[PDB]
Structures are given as structure tokens and as C-alpha cells.
Ligand binder design. Structure first.
Ligand SMILES: [Zn+2]
Ligand SMILES: [Zn+2]
Lengths: 134, 134
């Protein structure tokens, strides 16, 4: 019962719960992002903290599945912007409020902690935040 | 910058980093578990905190991929035990020490916290632990 182990479990459940429980999470969160405005491959890599290449994989699958449509900027031809299609919009929404609920779960969970206890939680989830880069 | 949001991000990166970066994590951790001893479908569901059905999906894929072999108990015919095959063992090992490294990352990360700060961390990762059931 080192906290190290507790951490490794926590993450393991996060992965194994997602897995088991057709679109990737990447795909789901791309749709979610493009739900509130259109964006480049590059905004999206930035926003979601992933490779350009990973967006372009997901993007292409989405386009194959009629989810998404690329339409080029009329000042800079290099740039393409993606909109959702009608088929996607129900899907984006559904995922959007799946995420609204998980925030309540997070809120309720955090309520168990004094607001000074929480500054450690904040600190902790913050260093944990991007020690996940490697 | 509510901690709620910080949490939802943390998890999101955990999922999107795993995804992008052929075997599932379930599969990888089943192999990992069966690396140190043989076990039922049921030990494994318990151990990994997932449905019986999810183990049997993963198990069957593994058997199709020649990773795994079921051999029945000689006192209770109802019970099947799974061993890894030779093809699997390199794979289990590799994943085993991928996990050895992530523990150092976790350790190094936790070192930044006073040992009283850490009792909150422990508390926190513990309630977070299985508020992830729903
Ligand atoms: Zn999501
Ligand atoms: Zn793993």
C-alpha cells in the first residue's frame, strides 16, 4: 500500500474502465471540441495535447464515417477547418453531457476535503497533470 | 480552473495518451497477471475490477492470437485455468517493466510533498479510487 501503487491502480482503472465499460476518445473529444467552433488539425493537437499525426488519423476516420467535413480558409489555402456533420451532432452532444455529469462526480468527491486540504489536492493533481507527458 | 476541471483533464490525458502514444490494456494486464500464476476467468475479473464478460472477450482474443491456453482443473471440471504461451512471455515481461518504470515516476512525483501533505494525497487518491465505479 505505497501511494505509488495506489496511483498505478487509479490509472489502470481509468484505462480498463474506459476500454470495457466504435469511436475513440480522441475522436469523441475532437467532435466535442469542434461542436463549439471549427478548428485546424493544429488547434486540436494543442487543445487535446496530442500529436498532429494522431489528429490526422482520427480526423480521417471521422471523415470516412461521414462525421466531419473539411473546408479550406479563403485567405490561406494551406489551412483546412473542420466542421461536424449532422450525423455527428447528436454524438457530440451526448458525449458533452456525459462530461457534464462526471464533473458533478468530481465536485461531490472534492467536497469531502477541507478547502486547505484541497490546496494540496490542487497541487498534487497539478504535478500529476503533466508528469504524464513521459 | 476549478479542481473539477483539472480532474476531468487529468483523466482525459490519461485516456488520450494511452490511445495515441494491437493488444488492449485489459489484455496486457491479464497477461501481466497470468505471468506470475495461472488463474480463472473469475480471479481475473476480481483482480482487474471488470466484468466476467470483459475477461472472456479479451481471453478469447488472446487465445485466437495464440497468446494464452486454457487447461481444466483435475478436481473440478467446471473450472478452466489460463497459462501464457511462449509467444506471450516476452510481451508480459515488457509490459511488466513498463510498469516498473511508471512507479518511479510516481515515486519521484510524490517526493515533492511533505509526508503530512501526502496523507491528504492518499486520502484523495483513495476516494477517487472507487468513485470511478460509476
Ligand atoms: Zn470523453
Ligand atoms: Zn499497463
Amino acid at each position: 500500500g505505497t501511494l505509488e501503487k495506489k496511483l498505478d491502480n487509479l490509472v489502470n482503472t481509468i484505462l480498463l474502465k474506459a476500454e470495457n465499460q466504435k469511436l475513440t476518445n480522441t475522436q469523441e473529444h475532437i467532435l466535442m471540441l469542434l461542436s463549439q467552433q471549427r478548428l485546424t488539425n493544429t488547434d486540436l493537437a494543442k487543445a487535446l495535447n496530442i500529436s498532429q499525426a494522431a489528429v490526422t488519423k482520427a480526423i480521417k476516420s471521422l471523415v470516412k464515417q461521414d462525421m466531419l467535413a473539411g473546408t479550406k480558409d479563403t485567405v490561406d489555402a494551406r489551412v483546412t477547418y473542420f466542421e461536424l456533420t449532422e450525423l455527428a451532432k447528436p454524438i457530440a452532444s451526448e458525449h458533452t453531457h456525459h462530461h457534464d455529469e462526471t464533473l458533478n462526480v468530481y465536485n461531490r468527491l472534492l467536497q469531502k476535503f477541507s478547502a486547505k486540504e484541497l490546496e494540496i489536492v490542487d497541487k498534487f493533481v497539478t504535478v500529476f497533470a503533466e508528469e504524464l507527458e513521459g
